Design a protein around this ligand. Sequence first.
Ligand SMILES: CCCCN(CCCC)CCCP(=O)(O)O
Ligand SMILES: CCCCN(CCCC)CCCP(=O)(O)O
Ligand SMILES: CCCCN(CCCC)CCCP(=O)(O)O
Ligand SMILES: CCCCN(CCCC)CCCP(=O)(O)O
Ligand SMILES: CCCCN(CCCC)CCCP(=O)(O)O
Ligand SMILES: [Ca+2]
Ligand SMILES: [Ca+2]
Ligand SMILES: [Ca+2]
Ligand SMILES: [Ca+2]
Ligand SMILES: [Ca+2]
Ligand SMILES: [Ca+2]
Ligand SMILES: [Ca+2]
Ligand SMILES: [Ca+2]
Ligand SMILES: [Ca+2]
Ligand SMILES: [Ca+2]
Lengths: 206, 206, 206, 206, 206
Amino acid sequence: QTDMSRKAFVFPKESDTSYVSLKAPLTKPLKAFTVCLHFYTELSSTRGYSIFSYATKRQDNEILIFWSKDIGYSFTVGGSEILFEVPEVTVAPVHICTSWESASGIVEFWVDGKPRVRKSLKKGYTVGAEASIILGQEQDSFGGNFEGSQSLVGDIGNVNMWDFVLSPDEINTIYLGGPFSPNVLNWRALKYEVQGEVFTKPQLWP
Amino acid sequence: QTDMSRKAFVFPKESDTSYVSLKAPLTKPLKAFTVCLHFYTELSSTRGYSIFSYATKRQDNEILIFWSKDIGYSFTVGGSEILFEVPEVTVAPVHICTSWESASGIVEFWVDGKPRVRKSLKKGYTVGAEASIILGQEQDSFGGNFEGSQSLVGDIGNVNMWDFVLSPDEINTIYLGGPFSPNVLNWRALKYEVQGEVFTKPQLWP
Amino acid sequence: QTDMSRKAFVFPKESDTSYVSLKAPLTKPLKAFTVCLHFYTELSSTRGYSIFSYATKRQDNEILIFWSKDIGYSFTVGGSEILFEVPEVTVAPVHICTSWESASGIVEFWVDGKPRVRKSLKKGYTVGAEASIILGQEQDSFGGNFEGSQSLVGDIGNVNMWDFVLSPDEINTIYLGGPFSPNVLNWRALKYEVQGEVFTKPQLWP
Amino acid sequence: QTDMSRKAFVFPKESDTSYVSLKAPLTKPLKAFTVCLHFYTELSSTRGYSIFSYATKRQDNEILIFWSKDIGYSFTVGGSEILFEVPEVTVAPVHICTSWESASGIVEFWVDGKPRVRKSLKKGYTVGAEASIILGQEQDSFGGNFEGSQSLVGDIGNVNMWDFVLSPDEINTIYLGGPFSPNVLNWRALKYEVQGEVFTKPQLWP
Amino acid sequence: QTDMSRKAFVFPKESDTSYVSLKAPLTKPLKAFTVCLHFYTELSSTRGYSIFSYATKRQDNEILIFWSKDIGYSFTVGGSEILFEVPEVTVAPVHICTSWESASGIVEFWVDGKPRVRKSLKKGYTVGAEASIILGQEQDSFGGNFEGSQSLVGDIGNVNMWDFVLSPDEINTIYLGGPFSPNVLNWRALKYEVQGEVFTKPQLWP
Ligand SMILES: CCCCN(CCCC)CCCP(=O)(O)O
Ligand SMILES: CCCCN(CCCC)CCCP(=O)(O)O
Ligand SMILES: CCCCN(CCCC)CCCP(=O)(O)O
Ligand SMILES: CCCCN(CCCC)CCCP(=O)(O)O
Ligand SMILES: CCCCN(CCCC)CCCP(=O)(O)O
Ligand SMILES: [Ca+2]
Ligand SMILES: [Ca+2]
Ligand SMILES: [Ca+2]
Ligand SMILES: [Ca+2]
Ligand SMILES: [Ca+2]
Ligand SMILES: [Ca+2]
Ligand SMILES: [Ca+2]
Ligand SMILES: [Ca+2]
Ligand SMILES: [Ca+2]
Ligand SMILES: [Ca+2]
C-alpha cells in the first residue's frame, strides 16, 4: 500500500525496459469496469503510444487504451477495437475516463470531464480477473514482449479503476477533484512494482 | 407512464431494426405544435440522420426533423421542406426546440436556447392526429420501412411535445431547466415501446 | 396608438405585397434625426434588402437603410449614398442606430451598441416632412413600386425615431433597453398600418 | 484654455485644408517626452495617414506618429524613422502612448495599455521648442504644405503630452482614465485653433 | 548586492558589445538547478537569440537557453541539446522556468506558469561551478566571442537561479510573485557588471 497523492510516474526518454506493474486484488471476472487517469506527452504528433495495458494469458489486449497518431483514441477490450476520432491535438495534460458494460456492450469515453458519444463493443463478454497491468509499455504477452515504438514518454498518474460503471455525476467529481473510492486500483493505496528507467516526481497538472 | 428524468435512450451502433415508439393520446388534429429534445452524435460529419419522425397513414413525413450532412438542419411538415443552414459543426450535446403554426405558417427553430430566423411552411395545413412517432429511425410508412443509412447513432432524450406555440420566454425556461408541463408528449410521463438494441442510461448532458 | 413592447413584425417569406406603414406626426422638416431598430434575417449572404424606407413625393430615397450583399450597410439621405463596409457577416439579431445632422453632415452608425467612424453626407440638406415610412419593402415612389428582390425576410421591430442627434450615453441605454421618449416614431405608441402577409409575434431578441 | 473632457475632434471626409493647431507653452528644448491619444478610423486598410504632426522650422518631422498601410505604426523623431509592425488590423478605437528619451534613445510604444518592445532612436538628440503641432494633416513645412493623401479621416482626441518619460504604472492610469497632469499639452486645458471642416462632438470611446 | 525589484535590463538595438555579467557565489559544482526569468522581444519571428548563457572554461555551452527561429525553445546542458517545439509564436512578455536533475536527467520547462512534458538530458553530468554568466549575448569562450546575430534585443529581467529542482507549487508562486528565496542568483540582491549600450528601466510586465 502506497499513498501516491500528488505524485506521478515519469518516463523521461523512449526505452524498451521501463514500466511499472500495478497489482490488483481480483477474484471474480469483470462484467464491467471504469478506468480513469491523467497523462501528458508530446508524442501524439510524432507516433502512437500505449496508455494503459491490461493483458491476460489468453488475450494480450484484454483491455487497452491506445493513442493512434492521425486517428485519435483507440479503445479495445477482448481484442476488438473501437475508435474515438480526434482531429485537433493540442499538447497539454489530459484526463480520460472510460467504462464498459457487458450486459449492454456500451462504452463511455470522457475526455477532460466532457463525454463522447456512446458506442458498442463486445456485448456479453467477460474480462479476465488474473491480469497483468503495465504502464509505459504495450504488452504482447503476459507482462512481456514490449515494443519500444509503443512506449509512453512523459508523465502518467492518478490512475483509478472500479469494477462497475460510473455515472456522469461521479465522473464529474473525479475530474473536478472530489472524493471517490476505487475498488480495484486506488492511487491512494497502490501496490505497484517499478522496473527500468522510471521516476516518481510531483505531478504537473493541478 | 414512466418518469424518464435524468435518463436517456442510447442507440449504440448503426442498425436497421432499433427504435423506440412514442404513444400519443391525440384526438384533435394539430393546428400548431412545438417539439423540443436533446441529442448527441458524431454522425453529423459522416452522414445525415433522423432526429424525430412523426408519420401519418397518408403522409410519411407529417413532421420530420432531420440533419443533412454538409447542409444543416432539415425541417419538413406535410412533406414540404425548409432548411436552417449550419456551416460550422462541433461535436457536443445539443438542445433543439422547433414550433409551427397553421394560421401563419411561421416556423421557429431554437438551438441551445438561441433562436434562428422565422420562415414559412405549409400555411393553413392541418397535421394528422392518428400518428406514429419513432426515435432512432426514419419512417417511410406507418411505423415501418426504415433505412439504415438514416439511423441515429448516439443519445436522445428530454423529448417533450406541446400542441401550441411556445413564446420565447417559455422556450427559455425549458432550456434553462425550469418546471414546465408538456401537453402532447411528456418525458416525465412517457408511454413508449422499445424494440431492438436500445438501452436506457443516465443522460450525458446537464 | 399601440403599445408594441416585446412584439415584433415578421415577414416570413419573400413577397412583393407585404409591408407595414408607419405613420409620423411631422410638421417641421427634419434638420437632423436618429433612427434605431432591431432586425434578424439570413438574407445577408444571399442578396440585399431594404431595412427602413423613408420616401417623399420628390425623392424616393429621402432616407434609406439598406444592406448590399458582399459590401455591407448602405446609408443614403437625399439620394446620396455612404457605405459602412462589413467583411465578416455572422447571422444573429442585430441592433442598428443611425443619425444625421444638417449643420455638419456628420452621420453616425452604431451596430450592437458599438460605433463606426463618422462620415459626411448632404451637409445643409433638409429632409421632407410629408413622408411615407415603410418596413419590409423598398420604395421607388410614394408608398409604392416595390421590388421583390429588395424584400426583407425575417423579423424587424423596436423601431424608434427622434428628430435630433442622440449622444453616445443615450445610444447605450437604447441598446441596453432603457427608457427613452421618441418624438417622431415610438414603439410604445405606434400608429402603423399592416398590409399583405405580415404577422405580429413576440420578439426573438432580448 | 478649454476643457475638452468627453469631447473629441472629428474629421468627417478626406480634405486638404482641415486641421486643428495645438498651442504649447514651450521654453526649453525637449530632452525626452511622452505622447498619448485616442483615435478611430477605417483608413488603415485603404492607405496611410498622419496621426500626430510636430514640426519645426528646420525639420518638418521633428516628431511624427504615422500609420503606413500594410506595415504598421511609423514613429519618427528628428527625421529618423522606426517601425512597430502590425500584421492584423481590426477597426476600432485605439489608444496609443509613445515616449522618447535622449540619454538612452529608448522609445516605448504602448497600444491599448499593452507595451511593445523597446527600440532605439536618435540618442543624444535635442528636440526643438518652437514647434507647430497639427492634427488631421501631415506637415511638410512649418504649419503648412499638407498632402491630402496623408489626411486623417475619423475621430481623434484625448491627446496629452509630457516633457518626461512615463513609467509603466503611470501609463496604466492614463489608459484607464485616471487623474494625470500633463505639463506640455493638456486635454482639460487645451489652447487650440480650428481651421477648415472639423467639428467638436462627444467622444465615441469610453 | 543590488535590489533590482521592478527594474529590468533593456538592450535597445542589435549590437555585438552589449551585455551584463551576473556574478554568482559558487563553490561546488551543480548536481541540479532551476532558472527563471522574464523577457520580451519581437526577434522571435526574424531570427534566433540567446536568452541565458552560462559558460565554463572547458565548455562554452555548459547551460544555454536559446530561441531558434521557426523551431521553438532550445535547452542544452553540457553541450547536448534538447528541444521544446513551439509552432505558433505571439509577441508578448513571457516567463520561463527550467530545471535539470543529474540523478535522473529529467528537465522541466515551464512557460507562463504552464509546464511542458518532462524530457531527459545528460544524466549523471556535473555542471561546473567556476562559470561566467552573461545576458544579451551568446558565449563561444569564457565571457567572450559574441556573435551579433545571436544578440537579444529587448527586455530581460527577474532572473533567479537555485541549486535544486523547484516543485510545481514553487514554480507557481515564483510566476505570481511569491516569497521565494534564491540561493545562487537573486534579483533582489544582484551582484552584476554592466557593459555596452544597456539600460535599467522599470519592467513592462506586471
Ligand atoms: C489487436 C488490436 C491491436 C490494437 N493496436 C492499435 C492499432 C492502432 C495503431 C495496438 C497494437 C497492439 P500490438 O503491438 O500487440 O500488435
Ligand atoms: C420528402 C422529403 C424528404 C426529406 N429528406 C431530407 C433530405 C435531406 C438529406 C429526408 C428523406 C426522407 P426518405 O428516406 O423517406 O426518403
Ligand atoms: C439611388 C441610390 C440607390 C441605393 N441602392 C443601394 C444599392 C446597393 C445594392 C438601393 C436601390 C434603390 P431602388 O430600388 O429604388 O432603385
Ligand atoms: C522623412 C520620413 C518620412 C516618414 N514618412 C512615413 C512613410 C510611411 C508611409 C511620412 C512621409 C512624410 P512627408 O509627406 O512629408 O513626405
Ligand atoms: C553546440 C550546441 C549549439 C546550440 N545552438 C543552438 C542552435 C539553434 C539555432 C546555439 C549555437 C551556439 P554557437 O554560436 O557558439 O555555435
Ligand atoms: Ca498487444
Ligand atoms: Ca506490442
Ligand atoms: Ca420519410
Ligand atoms: Ca427512410
Ligand atoms: Ca426598389
Ligand atoms: Ca427608391
Ligand atoms: Ca512631413
Ligand atoms: Ca506631406
Ligand atoms: Ca556557445
Ligand atoms: Ca556564438
